[PDB]
Each structure stands twice: as structure tokens, then as C-alpha cells.
């Protein structure tokens, strides 16, 4: 079973390490702090079944923030299209994507 | 065997198991598992004989492989979830790896291949510890991960463990190998019911712990390790023969004894979820268990095996061993049936 | 999903503070003392909006007033600033402790010609207040409605109805 | 299967609302059965150490009976509290959702058809 | 770049929320030359 | 308690020296009252920006400028 | 080997013999491969050639059992014009038992395998018709 | 995810298929155990350093130390075999079967 | 990449040195050494004290790695908890050293 | 080619594991896994984790596998076909997956895996005047009370285990 001594005698042992959105030294933010915050606030106190049936969009957004799969597919498709269009040579890249554009600062 | 060192080692084992019980982080679960196995290694090297070294080597290799699988599951869960609460996993591979990691830890067939060997090569106190207290922590781990447990894998492991344990205990004549295969069969029996109602799992775990403790306490009290000395014990104390007979009757789930309490009620949670063939199959394998149990009681008390001449000196000396908690655990393993709904305290 | 909204380059064209690291590091204390209010306004907008696209114009205000700092440096005491930033710029670590004489000379020249006080230790490390005219955003995270919580338990704990009901038990 | 009920007050053997129930009497048959189990444990302890079973260790037998009756009383209290929680939650969820529990019109036997299979 | 392929909307953010999300290294420098990518994503770690 | 001390000094000077130094290092941080000075030195280091808070209209303990007298100053490290 | 069971059950009973025969043969081959792999892992082979001989013997025996059982069930279902009958699976199970007894050079073992495999195939048809679930999902 | 993640998984499966079907003595098993050690360490460190979870930098170092002591235990076990049979071969581990 | 450039240059210079020491004197035509130690034919004895002190080194180095991050930790806000933790960890090192002293560890290889 | 350096090292890392996967002899396996530990630490170091990489160098390689070599020097007295067959099998699987991820840039073994270079998931942000992992490790003595307690207890108990189970009596 799951004995909750920490909730019984009111002493923290490992609650701080448990989640990524918890308090950390010098308040250093994670990559997906807001997504995890919204997912936890969606899935608090309502049960795991209703959390996985009702807050699926927030958890999917958090998983996409963690893994970055759709961004990988989008960028790979864009780069493959650039390689193809440079193969048949219909379009040429602009000077601002080659390193000779007098960068902003 | 310094008593201070033994006390500290036992406290370390208790601390590791309770760290598995009371923590809320996967790293602390693994911490408790590692400290538990590290402090249980000297328990199986108590007598300092090479068979104990063989058994401890096999045990360490299997437990370390299971622990490495456990980190594989934890790191995969971290990748797919980004959080560390001990709850339902967020990946099917994490659940699969965790399930066979805990099956390797608990000696569930076909990962049971270390259980009948290691228990054969260690002293009876270490065998009692391994077959009673070691099973507690991964039961808690499996209880806390039950939403994400795949049904097919745990059911296949349960039926394979029950069948293999019964068929492997059907042949052995040593007491420790029979105990090991009986433990395997009981493990499969109480992991088959886990996904439907874990209160039945906890009740069967408590009943099996009490009954195995009674069996091992009787074996250390009679100083018997094989079938023949357990047959020979009837010259020394017939009341111990009566006690081992009644608790082996209880061990096969024959009413009106305590061993009929869990499994029958396990069937009470099989037909609720519309499953009929499964409790019948596990009941037939429990009948196999009862067959080699009946063989043990035929060898022990229901007959009168021929003895040797030296029993007479053993009739001039009472049992000086510290027979601790034998009557209470013997009574609690035989006449607990009319207090069946006490399982409600395990909710 | 939805189309991500981006302002064009026409909202991003401004004059740039084309200065080195040591040039900013030499007058950073007078930077924090003189142009403090637009900086506080801009970063309060940044911290509460949590969106660059709703703060850009405010940053432009900073990019005006900061230039108004450097012009006041250029027309009056350009030579002590030149000495100070080149002495700071010689050090690879850009240590403040190795150019104390030029720091004192620049401080004296500024205090006689224009009168800006170098802040003490701990003055710039404290939290200040901002009077801002923007409204408070009620939904900074762009979050929908939270799910309805499940109902709790209510009523007195009644005794058991006809016992445990475990196939023959009435107690 | 009550993982969401006791989580607000964990590690409580007997909570405060358990005091709202009628406590079991000292003459409960289950309690007397547990006392009989304690007496049997004392008899077994006297028998396994080669002692007179009905005479030796009277204080030992009384301690066995007393400890067994104490733990049995507390376990019975926890069981009664748990089953009160169970049927209270049953009645509460039945009351809260009466769309999934329609009132069945119990028809009389004067018009319902029961198929008859003669025996011969 | 790509006006010919079907099933494409320009600026289709992959996140369901409309909240601002921090850009990636691949989202910013993912269309430049390799040297700028090297000096951006590995310039600090490889700086002596 | 006196002859045993000199006995352990003459037999094992290294062990008694290590025990004495360990006891001094145990009892001296509590006895010395300068630990709080290190505490306020560590707590006052601005690793992150003191992000300004919105003025509702009623806050006398916060200033509108870093040069204003109200607020926590750090002159005690300057004087020591 | 879950979808292979579905492909075996996707073909209606007593309609097309060929695809049922190959599906049952593939099921038997997979089962024999698992049994042979476990036998090689547990019982150490004398050499590579004897090990692959035992593997081929087990695999071909189980494949023949599957093919004979499927073929016999299909021809019995065709000759009785009744797909919804456990008699066809009983006859197919007895044919599989007879083939196993002939492979193992025995006749009493063959008759016992007839009885037990016919009863098992009858129960398989029982579960297919009445929807028996031995691997039941948690409902309550 | 990233390709280095899948490379670490393939490395861990390589260590798994090397740890089980051994032919040599127990040192090969402990070496494959250290392969599992190293793969898990690198994977955990990459995960913690990629997602900017600052606190969970306690995870990798601890993930070594504990099992490292456990690894030391295994070495002692081998010494026991080296004090009993002369060689630590796994084919000499056939005394508990009967 | 400059660090790896230095490592590659240093490793290749070592390779050049060992190539000079291994293959350059092979030009000479001196002789072939047929050549037909106290160890006669006995097996190598397993001096257990060396293995014991090696694993003691391993455990001490592991908890030295535990003890390591104090210079970075010294800037933390909660100094009292740090002081208690560091003193208790060094006390644990002292206790482990005392146990390794008492149970015949530091004898016959002191 | 350069921008996939970690991935290239990762390939070498897999190669390093093959270097002791067949296990012909413990000493050569230890050497191969030493090389694999070095390239895996290079993988860690290229992500900005200097402290964890030097933890790998100082403890895993220079302080513990030294003990492994010390122990294996006490056995395996000085002076295969299926070893080489497994080596070519691992080589073929490794190179086949290499062409899979270099041509398709996507594969399925358990999940969906991409073959594009890993230089897209890094961060352009700044931690300020401190390394993130440095004070991440430094937070152990201020927050990790229970973890340090159980770590010291487990290591002391391991010392007890070493003193007891190797006594022989």
C-alpha cells in the first residue's frame, strides 16, 4: 500500500523534487513551466480518470513542449522542401539567411 | 554475527522497506530497494558456507538486473511525463518494463528461476526473511501503479506463475524448494486479482505472510530441513506434528481454515468482472498445490515413519529454542475464517 | 491549431545602441540611476504580460531614453568616459576593482558638470514600485475554464445497513 | 478501492466521525470469538512447551485473552467504520444521481407472461 | 518558399494554446548557414 | 579524566588532536555570534533582479527609486 | 501474434478452406517456434545441428497439427452446412490429436489427444459463440 | 525525440543482450552491469540538462553512487568464488540444482 | 573545439614518440633473441588485503564525491542546514574509518 | 558533419558498447567500456554539463573501474568465433540503423524516432552569473536532507557489508 507519513506528521521529504514546476533555487524557469502549471491546475482534485478524459488537451500540449515532435516534423518538412527547391533551382535563399545582413544590434 | 551489527542490519532492511512504502518519489523507491537488497545480502551469508555464496550471487545478479530495468522504466517515464510522482505511468513501454522488472524482483514465472535455488542454499531464518518480508515492498509498488498496468501482461504472468509453481512444487522433496514453489504459486494467485480489487491482494498477502511465517517457525523449531527429518519429528513432540498438519491443511485452502479465506474471495472478485474460466483454472492449480501438501502431511503426521535409536536422548531434553510467536501465528492461520470481513480494515 | 500572431518589421525598426560591452559597463550605475522609471515600466509590463508582442512600444521608450543618457554623456564629459571605458575594456574579466582612479575621476567630473550620484551598495538591489496606466490582464496564461470539482461527502455517518452482507453475516 | 476517501486524513486507524457510530458492545459475539482465539493461543503455547495445559501459565493465558480481546475490539471498530463509510457513500451517490437509477414500474402478475414448461 | 504543396497553413503554431511560447534554437537559427548554427548552439560550450 | 587525557595524548597524539579540532569545529559556530553576519551577507546577494511590484496606492515600505531612503539598505557591510 | 488470431477468425467458418488452413498453419508454426525456442534455451542442445533438428521437428509437428485441425474443421463445417456448431471443431481437434499421436509414434496418446483437443476446440467455439472472456477487462 | 536518445536506448539494449547470453565468468556480467550503469547515467544527464530541470541534477550522481556500492558488493561475491573454486566461472555454479 | 584540438595534437605526438621508439630501431640488424622471475610454476596468490583496501578506496572516493559540492553550496541561504549536513557527513566518514579500524581492517597491511 | 558531433559520438558510444558486448575477455571488455565511458562523457560535456562530465571522469572511470581492473587482475590468468559473429551482427544492425536514420530521418522500433540533428532543442536563454547545473548540485546541502541521510546511511551500511561478508567466519 501507500502509507502517507509525510502528510501525517507534516514534514516534507521529497515533495520539492517531485514536479518540474516546483520551487527551485534562484527561481530558474524550466522550458515548460507554464504548460505543466496549467496541466496541474487542470488535473487537481478531480481524479485520474476525469483528468485523462477531460484535460487531454493540456497534457498533450505539455507532452509536445517536452518532446517537440510536431515542431521537428514541421521543420524537417520545411528543410526538405528547401533542399528540393534548390535541386530544381526555382528559388534562391535571401542574403539575410546567409550571414551577410548587418545583424540587428 | 555480532548482535549490534545484526540489529543495525535488520534496522537497515526495515528502513529500506519503509522508504519504499512511504515515499512519493521514484528515486526514493529505488533507494529503498537498493538499501534493502544491500542489507539483506549479509543475512544470506550468515552460516559462511559456499552454497550460501552461490545463492547470494544468483540473488544479487537477478535483483541488480531488475533494478536496472526499474531505472529504464523510470527514465522512460521521465522522458514521456517530465515528473516523478509515484502514480500511473505515462508510457506503455514504461509499464511493460516496470511490470517485468517487478516480476523479476518478486520471482514471478518465467522470471522465477532464482527462487527455488536461492531458498535452497540459505539458512531458514534468511529463507523466512526472503519469502516473507521481501515481497512486501514491490506489492506496494504494483499497488501504486495499477491504472497504467497492462491487463494482458499481468494476467499472463499470473497464470504462468501459478501453473509453473504448482508443477514445480509437485516434484521437489526438500522443504525449502517446496516452500519456494508454494510462494511462487501464491504470488501468482494474489497478482491475478490485483487489477480488479487490490484489497483482496493485500488480504492474501497478509494471510500468506502469516502462514509462511508459521511454516518457517515450525521448521526452525523442529530443526528439520528435509521430508525425512520432518517425518522423524513425531518421536520428539506430537503436538508439533498436529500443528504442522493443521497448518498444512490450511495451506491448501481447505475450509474451515484461514487459507480458504483469500482465494475464495478472489473468486468473489472474478465473477463480478465477468470472468469464469480463470478462477476455475487457478482452482485446479491450487488443487495441485493441495496434492503435494497432502503428500507432505502423509509423510509427516497421518502416518508413523520408522525412527532411529538416538531419539531416546532427545526425549530427555525439552525444546530450548526461542519459539517466538508460534502459538499466536498458528491460531491466526487456522481459526480466522468467521472473522473474514476484517479485510475491510485493509481498504 | 491557431495561427500564431507576429508583428511585422515595421513595428521593429528603431535606432540601435551600437555600443560595446565595456561602454555599457562603465556607465551602468548612472544608467540605472538616471533612466530608471522607463526601465521599471517596461519590465513590469514584460513580467505581467508575459508576451513580447504586448510590450514592444514600451521597450521603444527605453530605447529612446537610454540614448538620451548617452548624448548627455557625449556633449559634456566625453573624455573621462572614454578613459573609463578603455581602462575597463583592457581587462579581460572586466573587473571594476582595477580602475578605481578613473572611476573616481569620472564620478567627480559628472558630479561637478551634471551631478549624477553613483548609487551605494544595495540601492540597485532593492525592489521598487511602478505607477503604470495599463490594465491588469485577467488571463495572462490564456487558460480556459477549469473542470468542475467532484462533490464532497455530507451528512451524518449512519450505521451499517443489515451488517456486512458477506453471504451470511449479519454483524 | 477507497483510494480517494482516506487521502484527506491519511494514517488514521479510527477517525473522529467513527465516534458518531454506535460502538460495539463488550458482549459482541465476534469479540467473544476473538477472546476464545486468545484462550486457544494460550492453550497451544502451554502445549508446545510441554506444560500442564489447563493449569500452568494462568497469568500468561489471561494476558493472551486480554491482548486478543483488545486488538479484536479495535479491529471491529475499524470494520464498522469502514462499512458505514461504504453504505453511506452508496446511498449518497444513489441520491445524487437518479437518472442512471430509474424507478422501475413493478408490474403485477395479472398481465405479465411467464412461460410454462410442463413436466412429465 | 512553398506555395505548391497542399494541406499547409502558414504560421500554424503546433501548440493549442494562444499563449506566447519561448522560441527554439531550431525555430530561430534553423534556416541559416551552418556556421551561424555552430556559433549559436555550440559557441559558448566550445569557447575555450 | 585527567590521566586518561594525557595517556591518549602520549599514545596517539594524532587521534586526540583530531578529536579536539573536531570538537572545536562543532562548538565554535554556535558560540561565535558572527554566523548571522554571514547569513545576512548570503541573503542580500542579488543573483536575480528585484522585479518591481505594481503600485496599487497603499505601500509605504516600498520606494519609487533606488536612491530613495526607504527600503533595505546595505551599509552594514560597508561599515562592518 | 494477436492479429493472426483475428485473421484466423475474420474468415467465416465453412466458407473458404485455403485461408483458414494457412492461418491455422501459421498459428501452429508460431506456437512450435516458441516451444522450440524455450526448449533450446532451457535444455542445452548437443550441437547446432541437433538443436535445429529439434527446432524443425517441433515446428513442423505443430504446423501439421494446426493445418490438419483447421482443414478438418473447415471440411466438417462445409459437409454439415452449419458454421455455428462445435461438432466441427470437435472433429478437427480429434484430427489434430490423431496427427499428434501419429507423429509421436503412439495410439493411446493419440486417443487422449483426440479427446482433450476436441474438448478444447469445442470450448473455443463456445467462447466464440457465447462471448466468453477469460481475459476480462475490469468492469466493476 | 532526439536521435541521441534512441542511440542510448540501442546501447542499453546492446548491454541487455550482452548481459544475459554470456559464456564467460562473472566479470563479464559485472561489466555489462556497468554498461547498464553508464547508459542510464548518460540518459538521465541528457534528459535533466535538456529540459532545464535544475533540482533533478541530484538524480544522475545519486543514480551512480548507490548502485556503485552495490557494484562493490558484486566484486566481493566474485572474490568468494575466487576463494572457493579457484576460478569464477559460471559453469561451476551447478551445486544448488540437486 | 580548441580543447579537442590540443588533445588530438598531444595524442598524435605521443603516437609519434611511440612509433619512433617501436619501429625506428627496426632498421638495425642486431640479433634475434630466442631467450630460452621468482614465480616458478605456482598460481598467483589472492592477497585479500589488497582487494579490501581497493574497495575501501572505492567507498571513500564515492562519498568524497558526495562531499564535493561544498564550495558551490557555501553561497546558499540556509547556512545552518548546510553546516549540520557537512559536519554530519564528515562525522559519517570518521565513523566508517573507526569501524574499518576496529574490525581488523588495518592489520597486516596497516 | 560537425553539427551532429554529439550524435556522431553517440554512434561511437554504441560502438563502444559493442566493444564489450561480445565479452571475449574481461580485460579487453574493461578497456572497451573505458573508451565508451570516455565518449559518453564527451556526449555529456557537449551539452554544457561540465560538472556531471567530470563526475563521470573522476568517479566512474578513474575511481571505480580502476577497482574493477584491480579485482579482475586477481583472476583471469594470462596466456572467439561466436564472439566475432555477434560482433558482425552488431555491426550490421548498427550500420543498418545508421543508414535508416541518415536516409529516412525517421524510424519506428518502439516509438517514432527522428533522424534530424539535435541542434534544434537547445536554449538561447541565459542563466545569469551562474551555471545552472553547478548550483543545481549545490542545492543538495540546503534542500536534500533526507537524500543525504539515506545516502550516508547506505554507504556506511555498505562498509558494514564489506567488513562482514568478506570476513569468511
From Swiss-Prot, chain B:
Pfam families: NADH_dehy_S2_C (PF06444), Proton_antipo_M (PF00361)
Catalyses which reaction(s): a ubiquinone + NADH + 5 H(+)(in) = a ubiquinol + NAD(+) + 4 H(+)(out)
Compartments reported by the entry: Mitochondrion inner membrane
EC number of this enzyme: 7.1.1.2
GO cellular component terms listed in the entry, alphabetical order: mitochondrial inner membrane; respiratory chain complex I
GO BP annotations, alphabetical order: mitochondrial electron transport, NADH to ubiquinone; mitochondrial respiratory chain complex I assembly; reactive oxygen species metabolic process
Source organism, top-level taxon: Eukaryota
This protein's UniProt keywords: Electron transport, Membrane, Mitochondrion, Mitochondrion inner membrane, NAD, Respiratory chain, Translocase, Transmembrane, Transmembrane helix, Transport, Ubiquinone
Disulfide-linked positions: none
Primary subcellular site in the record, as a coarse category: mitochondrion
Enzyme class, broadest EC rank: translocase
Recorded topology in the membrane: Multi-pass membrane protein
Function: Core subunit of the mitochondrial membrane respiratory chain NADH dehydrogenase (Complex I) which catalyzes electron transfer from NADH through the respiratory chain, using ubiquinone as an electron acceptor. Essential for the catalytic activity and assembly of complex I.
PANTHER family in the record: NADH-UBIQUINONE OXIDOREDUCTASE CHAIN 2
This protein's name: NADH-ubiquinone oxidoreductase chain 2
Organism field: Ovis aries
Upper taxonomic lineage: Eukaryota, Metazoa, Chordata, Craniata, Vertebrata
From Swiss-Prot, chain H:
UniProt keyword terms in alphabetical order: Electron transport, Membrane, Mitochondrion, Mitochondrion inner membrane, NAD, Respiratory chain, Translocase, Transmembrane, Transmembrane helix, Transport, Ubiquinone
Pfam families per UniProt: Oxidored_q2
Topology term for the membrane: Multi-pass membrane protein
Chief place where the protein resides: mitochondrion
Any GO CC annotation of this UniProt entry: respiratory chain complex I
Catalytic activity annotation: a ubiquinone + NADH + 5 H(+)(in) = a ubiquinol + NAD(+) + 4 H(+)(out)
Complex and partners: Core subunit of respiratory chain NADH dehydrogenase (Complex I) which is composed of 45 different subunits.
Family under the similarity heading: Belongs to the complex I subunit 4L family.
Protein name per the record: NADH-ubiquinone oxidoreductase chain 4L
Organism of origin: Ovis aries (Sheep)
Lineage: Eukaryota, Metazoa, Chordata, Craniata, Vertebrata
Curated annotation (Swiss-Prot), chain I:
Enzyme type, top EC level: translocase
Parts of the chain that traverse the membrane: 3-23, 50-70, 79-99
Subcellular location: Mitochondrion inner membrane
InterPro entries: NADH_UbQ/plastoQ_OxRdtase_su3 (IPR000440), NDAH_ubi_oxred_su3_sf (IPR038430)
UniProt keyword annotation of Protein transport present: no
Membrane topology: Multi-pass membrane protein
Reaction(s) catalysed (UniProt annotation): a ubiquinone + NADH + 5 H(+)(in) = a ubiquinol + NAD(+) + 4 H(+)(out)
Keyword Secreted on entry: no
Any GO BP: mitochondrial electron transport, NADH to ubiquinone
A Pfam entry, by short name: Oxidored_q4
GO cellular component, one term: respiratory chain complex I
Gene Ontology molecular function: NADH dehydrogenase (ubiquinone) activity
Keyword terms: Electron transport, Membrane, Mitochondrion, Mitochondrion inner membrane, NAD, Respiratory chain, Translocase, Transmembrane, Transmembrane helix, Transport, Ubiquinone
Enzyme Commission number, as recorded: 7.1.1.2
Protein family: Belongs to the complex I subunit 3 family.
Quaternary structure annotation from Swiss-Prot or TrEMBL: Core subunit of respiratory chain NADH dehydrogenase (Complex I) which is composed of 45 different subunits. Interacts with TMEM186. Interacts with TMEM242.
Function in brief: Core subunit of the mitochondrial membrane respiratory chain NADH dehydrogenase (Complex I) which catalyzes electron transfer from NADH through the respiratory chain, using ubiquinone as an electron acceptor. Essential for the catalytic activity of complex I.
Protein name listed in UniProt: NADH-ubiquinone oxidoreductase chain 3
Gene that encodes it: MT-ND3
Swiss-Prot record, chain J:
Enzyme class: translocase
Pfam families attached to this UniProt entry: Oxidored_q3 (PF00499)
Family listed: Belongs to the complex I subunit 6 family.
This protein's record includes keyword Translocase: yes
Gene assigned in the entry: MT-ND6
Gene Ontology CC terms: mitochondrial inner membrane; respiratory chain complex I
Subcellular location: Mitochondrion inner membrane
Record text on subunit structure and interactions: Core subunit of respiratory chain NADH dehydrogenase (Complex I) which is composed of 45 different subunits.
Chief place where the protein resides: mitochondrion
Functional description taken from the UniProt entry: Core subunit of the mitochondrial membrane respiratory chain NADH dehydrogenase (Complex I) which catalyzes electron transfer from NADH through the respiratory chain, using ubiquinone as an electron acceptor. Essential for the catalytic activity and assembly of complex I.
Keywords tagged on the record: Electron transport, Membrane, Mitochondrion, Mitochondrion inner membrane, NAD, Respiratory chain, Translocase, Transmembrane, Transmembrane helix, Transport, Ubiquinone
Transmembrane segments: 1-21, 25-45, 47-67, 82-102, 143-163
Protein's name in the database: NADH-ubiquinone oxidoreductase chain 6
Bilayer disposition of the protein: Multi-pass membrane protein
Substrates-to-products reaction catalysed: a ubiquinone + NADH + 5 H(+)(in) = a ubiquinol + NAD(+) + 4 H(+)(out)
Signal peptide: none
EC number per UniProt: 7.1.1.2
Entry GO MF terms: NADH dehydrogenase (ubiquinone) activity
Alphabetical GO biological process terms: mitochondrial electron transport, NADH to ubiquinone; mitochondrial respiratory chain complex I assembly
Amino acid at each position: 500500500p501507500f502509507f502517507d507519513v509525510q502528510k501525517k506528521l507534516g514534514v516534507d521529504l521529497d515533495h520539492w523534487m517531485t514536479i518540474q514546476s516546483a520551487e527551485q533555487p534562484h527561481r530558474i524557469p524550466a522550458r515548460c513551466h507554464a504548460f505543466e502549471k496549467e496541466w496541474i491546475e487542470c488535473a487537481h482534485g478531480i481524479g485520474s480518470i476525469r483528468a485523462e478524459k477531460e484535460c487531454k488537451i493540456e497534457f498533450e500540449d505539455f507532452r509536445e513542449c517536452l518532446l517537440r515532435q510536431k515542431t521537428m516534423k514541421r521543420l524537417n518538412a520545411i528543410k526538405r522542401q528547401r533542399d528540393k527547391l534548390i535541386k530544381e533551382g526555382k528559388y534562391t535563399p535571401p542574403p539575410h539567411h546567409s550571414g551577410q545582413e548587418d545583424l540587428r544590434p | 554475527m555480532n548482535p549490534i551489527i545484526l540489529i543495525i542490519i535488520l534496522m537497515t532492511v526495515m528502513l529500506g522497506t519503509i522508504i519504499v512504502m512511504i515515499s512519493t518519489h521514484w528515486l526514493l523507491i529505488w533507494i529503498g530497494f537498493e538499501m534493502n537488497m544491500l542489507a539483506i545480502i549479509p543475512i544470506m551469508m550468515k552460516k559462511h558456507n559456499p552454497r550460501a555464496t552461490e545463492a547470494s550471487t544468483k540473488y544479487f545478479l537477478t535483483q541488480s538486473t531488475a533494478s536496472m530495468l526499474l531505472m529504464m522504466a523510470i527514465i522512460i517515464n521521465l522522458m514521456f511525463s517530465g515528473q516523478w510522482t509515484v502514480m500511473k505511468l505515462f508510457n506503455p513501454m514504461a509499464s511493460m518494463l516496470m511490470t517485468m522488472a517487478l516480476a523479476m524482483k518478486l520471482g514471478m514465472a518465467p522470471f522465477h528461476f532464482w527462487v527455488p535455488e536461492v531458498t535452497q542454499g540459505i539458512p531458514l531464518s534468511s529463507g523466512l526473511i526472503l519469502l516473507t518480508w521481501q515481497k512486501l515492498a514491490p506489492m506496494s509498488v504494483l499497488y501504486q501503479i495499477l491504472p497504467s498496468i497492462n491487463l494482458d501482461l499481468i494476467l499472463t504472468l499470473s497464470i504462468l506463475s501459478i501453473t509453473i509453481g504448482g508443477w514445480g512444487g509437485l516434484n521437489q522433496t526438500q522443504l525449502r524448494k517446496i516452500m519456494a514453489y508454494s510462494s511462487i504459486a501464491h504470488m501468482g494467485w494474489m497478482t491475478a486479482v490485483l487489477l480488479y480489487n487490490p484489497t483482496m491482494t493485500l488480504l492474501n498477502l497478509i494471510i500468506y505472510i502469516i502462514m509462511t511465517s508459521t511454516m518457517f517457525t515450525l521448521f526452525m523449531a523442529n530443526s528439520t530441513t528435509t521430508t525425512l527429518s520432518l517425518s522423524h519429528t513425531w518421536n520428539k513432540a506430537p503436538i508439533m506434528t498436529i500443528l504442522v498438519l493443521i497448518t498444512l491443511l490450511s495451506m491448501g485452502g481447505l475450509p474451515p481454515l484461514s487459507g480458504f479465506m483469500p482465494k475464495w474471495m478472489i473468486i468473489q472478485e472474478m465473477t463480478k468482472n465477468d470472468s469464469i474460466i480463470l478462477p476455475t483454472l487457478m482452482a485446479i492449480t491450487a488443487l495441485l498445490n493441495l496434492y503435494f501438501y497432502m503428500r507432505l502431511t502423509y509423510s509427516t503426521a497421518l502416518t508413523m515413519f520408522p525412527s532411529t535409536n538416538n531419539m531416546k536422548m532427545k526425549w530427555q531434553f525439552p525444546t530450548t529454542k526461542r519459539m517466538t510467536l508460534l502459538p499466536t501465528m498458528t491460531v491466526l492461520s487456522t481459526m480466522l475464517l468467521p472473522l473474514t470481513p476484517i479485510l475491510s480494515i485493509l481498504e | 491549431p491557431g495561427i500564431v500572431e507576429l508583428p511585422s518589421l515595421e513595428d521593429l525598426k528603431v535606432q540601435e545602441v551600437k555600443v560595446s560591452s565595456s561602454v555599457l559597463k562603465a556607465a551602468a550605475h548612472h544608467y540605472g540611476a538616471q533612466c530608471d522609471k522607463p526601465n521599471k515600466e517596461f519590465m513590469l509590463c514584460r513580467w505581467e504580460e508575459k508576451d513580447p508582442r504586448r510590450c514592444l512600444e514600451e521597450g521603444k521608450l527605453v530605447n529612446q531614453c537610454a540614448l538620451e543618457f548617452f548624448r548627455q554623456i557625449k556633449r559634456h564629459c566625453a573624455e573621462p568616459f572614454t578613459e573609463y571605458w578603455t581602462c575597463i575594456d583592457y581587462s579581460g574579466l572586466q573587473l571594476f576593482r582595477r580602475c578605481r582612479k578613473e572611476q573616481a575621476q569620472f564620478d567627480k567630473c559628472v558630479l561637478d558638470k551634471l551631478g549624477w550620484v553613483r548609487p551605494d551598495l544595495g540601492e540597485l538591489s532593492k525592489v521598487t514600485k511602478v505607477k503604470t496606466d495599463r490594465p491588469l490582464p485577467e488571463n495572462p496564461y490564456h487558460s480556459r475554464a477549469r473542470p468542475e470539482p467532484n462533490p464532497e461527502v455530507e451528512g451524518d455517518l449512519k450505521p451499517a445497513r443489515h451488517g456486512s452482507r458477506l453471504f451470511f453475516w449479519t454483524m | 478501492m477507497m483510494t480517494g476517501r482516506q487521502a484527506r486524513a491519511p494514517l488514521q486507524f479510527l477517525p473522529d466521525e467513527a465516534r458518531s457510530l454506535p460502538p460495539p458492545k463488550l458482549t459482541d459475539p465476534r469479540l467473544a470469538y476473538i477472546g476464545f482465539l486468545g484462550y486457544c493461543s494460550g492453550l497451544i503455547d502451554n502445549a508446545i512447551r510441554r506444560r500442564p495445559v489447563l493449569s500452568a501459565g494462568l497469568h500468561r493465558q489471561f494476558l493472551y485473552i486480554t491482548s486478543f480481546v483488545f486488538v479484536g475490539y479495535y479491529l471491529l471498530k475499524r470494520q464498522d467504520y469502514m462499512y458505514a463509510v461504504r453504505d453511506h457513500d452508496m446511498f449518497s451517490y444513489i441520491k445524487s444521481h437518479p437518472e442512471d437509477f430509474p424507478e422501475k414500474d413493478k408490474k403485477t402478475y395479472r398481465e405479465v407472461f411467464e412461460e410454462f414448461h410442463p413436466v412429465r | 518558399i512553398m506555395k505548391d504543396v497542399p494541406g499547409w497553413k502558414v504560421g500554424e503554431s503546433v501548440f493549442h494554446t494562444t499563449r506566447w511560447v519561448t522560441p527554439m534554437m531550431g525555430e530561430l537559427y534553423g534556416l541559416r548557414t551552418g556556421e551561424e548554427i555552430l556559433s549559436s548552439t555550440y559557441g559558448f560550450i566550445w569557447y575555450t | 579524566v585527567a590521566a586518561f587525557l594525557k595517556n591518549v595524548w602520549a599514545k596517539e597524539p594524532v587521534l586526540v588532536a583530531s578529536f579536539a579540532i573536531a570538537g572545536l569545529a562543532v562548538i565554535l559556530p554556535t558560540l561565535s555570534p558572527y554566523t548571522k553576519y554571514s547569513l545576512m551577507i548570503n541573503r542580500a546577494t542579488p543573483y536575480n533582479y528585484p522585479v518591481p511590484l505594481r503600485d496599487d496606492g497603499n505601500m509605504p515600505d516600498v520606494p519609487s527609486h533606488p536612491q530613495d531612503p526607504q527600503g533595505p539598505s546595505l551599509e552594514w557591510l560597508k561599515r562592518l | 501474434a494477436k492479429t493472426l488470431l483475428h485473421q484466423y477468425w475474420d474468415i467465416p467458418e465453412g466458407t473458404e478452406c485455403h485461408r483458414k488452413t494457412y492461418a491455422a498453419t501459421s498459428i501452429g508454426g508460431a506456437s512450435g517456434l516458441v516451444v522450440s525456442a524455450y526448449s533450446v534455451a532451457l535444455k542445452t542442445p548437443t550441437s547446432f545441428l541437433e538443436g535445429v533438428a529439434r527446432t524443425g521437428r517441433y515446428t513442423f509437428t505443430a504446423a501439421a497439427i494446426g493445418a490438419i485441425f483447421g482443414l478438418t474443421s473447415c471440411i466438417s463445417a462445409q459437409v454439415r452446412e452449419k458454421p455455428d456448431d462445435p461438432l466441427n471443431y470437435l472433429i478437427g481437434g480429434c484430427a489434430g490429436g490423431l496427427t499428434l499421436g501419429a507423429r509421436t509414434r503412439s495410439y493411446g496418446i493419440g486417443a487422449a489427444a483426440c479427446a482433450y483437443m476436441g474438448l478444447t476446440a469445442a470450448l473455443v467455439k463456445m467462447g466464440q459463440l457465447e462471448g466468453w472472456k477469460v481475459f476480462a477487462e475490469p468492469k466493476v | 525525440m532526439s536521435l541521441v536518445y534512441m542511440n542510448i536506448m540501442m546501447a542499453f539494449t546492446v548491454s541487455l543482450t550482452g548481459l544475459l547470453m554470456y559464456r564467460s565468468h562473472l566479470m563479464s556480467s559485472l561489466l555489462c552491469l556497468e554498461g547498464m550503469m553508464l547508459s542510464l547515467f548518460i540518459l538521465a544527464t541528457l534528459m535533466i540538462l535538456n529540459s532545464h530541470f535544475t533540482l533533478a541534477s541530484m538524480m544522475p550522481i545519486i543514480l551512480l553512487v548507490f548502485a556503485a556500492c552495490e557494484a562493490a558488493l558484486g566484486l566481493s561475491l566474485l572474490v568468494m568464488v575466487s576463494n572457493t573454486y579457484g576460478t569464477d566461472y559460471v559453469q561451476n555454479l551447478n551445486l544448488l540444482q540437486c | 573545439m580548441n580543447l579537442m584540438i590540443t588533445l588530438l595534437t598531444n595524442f598524435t605526438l605521443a603516437t609519434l614518440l611511440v612509433t619512433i621508439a617501436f619501429w625506428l630501431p627496426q632498421l638495425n640488424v642486431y640479433s634475434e633473441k630466442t631467450s630460452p622471475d621468482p614465480m616458478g610454476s605456482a598460481r598467483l596468490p589472492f592477497s585479500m588485503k589488497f582487494f579490501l583496501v581497493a574497495i575501501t578506496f572505492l567507498l571513500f572516493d564515492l562519498e568524497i564525491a558526495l562531499l564535493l559540492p561544498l564550495p558551490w553550496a557555501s553561497q546558499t541561504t540556509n547556512l545552518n542546514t548546510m553546516l549540520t549536513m557537512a559536519l554530519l557527513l564528515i562525522f559519517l566518514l570518521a565513523v566508517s574509518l573507526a569501524y574499518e579500524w576496529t574490525q581488523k581492517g588495518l592489520e597486516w597491511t596497516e | 558533419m560537425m553539427t551532429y558531433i554529439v550524435f556522431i559520438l553517440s554512434i561511437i558510444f554504441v560502438m563502444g558498447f559493442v566493444g564489450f558486448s561480445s565479452k571475449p575477455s574481461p580485460i579487453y571488455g574493461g578497456l572497451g567500456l573505458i573508451v565508451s565511458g570516455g565518449v559518453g562523457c564527451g556526449i555529456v560535456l557537449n551539452f554544457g554539463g561540465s560538472f556531471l562530465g567530470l563526475m563521470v571522469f573522476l568517479i566512474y572511470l578513474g575511481g571505480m573501474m580502476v577497482v574493477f581492473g584491480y579485482t579482475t587482475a586477481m583472476a583471469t590468468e594470462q596466456y572467439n568465433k561466436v564472439v566475432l559473429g555477434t560482433f558482425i551482427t552488431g555491426l550490421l544492425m548498427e550500420f543498418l540503423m545508421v543508414y535508416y536514420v541518415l536516409k529516412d530521418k525517421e524510424v519506428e522500433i518502439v516509438f517514432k524516432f527522428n533522424g534530424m540533428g539535435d541542434w534544434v532543442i537547445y536554449d538561447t536563454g541565459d542563466s545569469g552569473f551562474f551555471s545552472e547545473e553547478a548550483m543545481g548540485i549545490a542545492a543538495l546541502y540546503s534542500y536534500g536532507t533526507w537524500l543525504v541521510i539515506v545516502t550516508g546511511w547506505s554507504l556506511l551500511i555498505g562498509v558494514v557489508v564489506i567488513m562482514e561478508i568478506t570476513r569468511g567466519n
